[PDB]
């Protein structure tokens, strides 16, 4: 038995952004107080962790346009 | 028995944004108080965790347009 | 028995945004008080967790237009 | 027995937004008090959790237009 | 039985950003206080961890446009 698979996706997309003035962003955190207490941490497989943090992020992109593709063709008998 | 599969998706989409003035954003947190207490943490498989945090994020993109595709063709007998 | 599958989706969509002035956003949190107490945490498979947090997010995009596609063609006998 | 499947969806949609002035947004939280007490947490498969949180989100997009597609063609004998 | 697989995806996408003036970003954290206490940490396989941190990130790109592709063709008998 012949098996013919044609996998032809076509993509002409566009992700466009236009801005005139990104200005005057003020990010002013006012301190903090973090206390974490533990005894045993056992992480095993594919672990992303944050135990104690006080994090300030100022993320100002002129673009920031994400675009995620995923093509998956699985073939078995 | 012949098996013929044609997988031809066509995409001419667009994701467009226009802005005139991103201005005058003030992010002013006023401190905080976090206390976490534990004894044993056992994380095993594909784990994203945050135990104790005090996080300030100022995210000001001029665009910020996301677009997620996912094509999956699974074939078995 | 012949099996013929034609999978031809066509997409000419658009997601459009226009703004004149993103201005004068004030985000002013006033502190806080978080206390979490535990003994044992056992997370096993595909876990997203947040135990103790005091999080301030200022998210001001000039766009922010999301668009999610998902094509799935499963074939078995 | 011949089996013929034609899967041809056509999409010419649009999601359009227009704004003149996004201005003068004030988000001013006034503190808080969170206390959570536990002993054992066992999360097993595909778990999204938040145990103790005091979260302030200011989300001001100039667009913010979502659009979700889902095409699923399942074929078995 | 002959098996013919054609895997021909076509991509003419574009991710475009235009900005006029990225200006006047002020990121002014106000200190902090982090205390983490543990006894045993056992990390085993593919582990990303942050135990005690006080991190300030100012990320101002003129672009910042991400684009992620993933093609996967798995074939077994």
Curated annotation (Swiss-Prot), chains A, B, C, D, E:
Changing residue 49 to L: In fatal respiratory hypoventilation; unusual apparent autosomal recessive inheritance; reduced binding to microtubules as well as increased fibrillization and aggregation. The modification Omega-N-methylarginine is found at residue 46. The record marks 8, 14, 18, 28, 37, 40, 67, 72 as: Not glycated. Phosphorylation at serine and threonine residues in S-P or T-P motifs by proline-directed protein kinases (PDPK1, CDK1, CDK5, GSK3, MAPK) (only 2-3 sites per protein in interphase, seven-fold increase in mitosis, and in the form associated with paired helical filaments (PHF-tau)), and at serine residues in K-X-G-S motifs by MAP/microtubule affinity-regulating kinase (MARK1, MARK2, MARK3 or MARK4), causing detachment from microtubules, and their disassembly. Phosphorylation decreases with age. Polyubiquitinated. Requires functional TRAF6 and may provoke SQSTM1-dependent degradation by the proteasome. PHF-tau can be modified by three different forms of polyubiquitination. 'Lys-48'-linked polyubiquitination is the major form, 'Lys-6'-linked and 'Lys-11'-linked polyubiquitination also occur. There is a cross-link at residues 8, 14, 18, 28, 40, 44, 50, 66, 72 (Glycyl lysine isopeptide (Lys-Gly) (interchain with G-Cter in ubiquitin)). It is found in: Cytoplasm, Cytosol; Cell membrane; Cytoplasm, Cytoskeleton; Cell projection, Axon. Signal peptide: none annotated. The modification N6,N6-dimethyllysine is found at residue 8. Tau/MAP repeats lie at residues 3-33, 34-65. It comes from the Eukaryota. The modification N6-acetyllysine is found at residues 8, 14, 18, 28, 40, 44, 66. Expressed in neurons. Isoform PNS-tau is expressed in the peripheral nervous system while the others are expressed in the central nervous system. Changing residue 17 to F: In PIDB; markedly reduced ability of tau to promote microtubule assembly. Glycans are attached at residues 44, 50, 66. Coiled coil: none annotated. The modification Phosphoserine is found at residues 2, 21, 49, 53. Changing residue 34 to M: In FTD1; ultrastructural and biochemical characteristics indistinguishable from Alzheimer disease; accelerates aggregation of tau into filaments. The tau/MAP repeat binds to tubulin. Type I isoforms contain 3 repeats while type II isoforms contain 4 repeats. Interacts with MARK1, MARK2, MARK3 and MARK4. Interacts with PSMC2 through SQSTM1. Interacts with SQSTM1 when polyubiquitinated. Interacts with FKBP4. Binds to CSNK1D. Interacts with SGK1. Interacts with PIN1. Interacts with LRRK2. Interacts with LRP1, leading to endocytosis; this interaction is reduced in the presence of LRPAP1/RAP. Promotes microtubule assembly and stability, and might be involved in the establishment and maintenance of neuronal polarity. The C-terminus binds axonal microtubules while the N-terminus binds neural plasma membrane components, suggesting that tau functions as a linker protein between both. Axonal polarity is predetermined by TAU/MAPT localization (in the neuronal cell) in the domain of the cell body defined by the centrosome. The short isoforms allow plasticity of the cytoskeleton whereas the longer isoforms may preferentially play a role in its stabilization. It is linked to In Alzheimer disease, the neuronal cytoskeleton in the brain is progressively disrupted and replaced by tangles of paired helical filaments (PHF) and straight filaments, mainly composed of hyperphosphorylated forms of TAU (PHF-TAU or AD P-TAU). O-GlcNAcylation is greatly reduced in Alzheimer disease brain cerebral cortex leading to an increase in TAU/MAPT phosphorylations. Frontotemporal dementia 1: A form of dementia characterized by pathologic finding of frontotemporal lobar degeneration, presenile dementia with behavioral changes, deterioration of cognitive capacities and loss of memory. In some cases, parkinsonian symptoms are prominent. Neuropathological changes include frontotemporal atrophy often associated with atrophy of the basal ganglia, substantia nigra, amygdala. In most cases, protein tau deposits are found in glial cells and/or neurons. This is Microtubule-associated protein tau. It comes from Homo sapiens (Human).
């Amino acid at each position: 038995g012949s098996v013919q698979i044609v996998y032809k996706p076509v993509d002409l997309s566009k992700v466009t952004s236009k801005c005139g003035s990104l200005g005057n962003i003020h990010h002013k955190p006012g301190g903090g107080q973090v206390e974490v207490k533990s005894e045993k941490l056992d992480f095993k497989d594919r672990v992303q962790s944050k135990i104690g943090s006080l994090d300030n992020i100022t993320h100002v992109p002129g673009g920031g346009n994400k675009k995620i593709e995923t093509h998956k063709l699985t073939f078995r008998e």
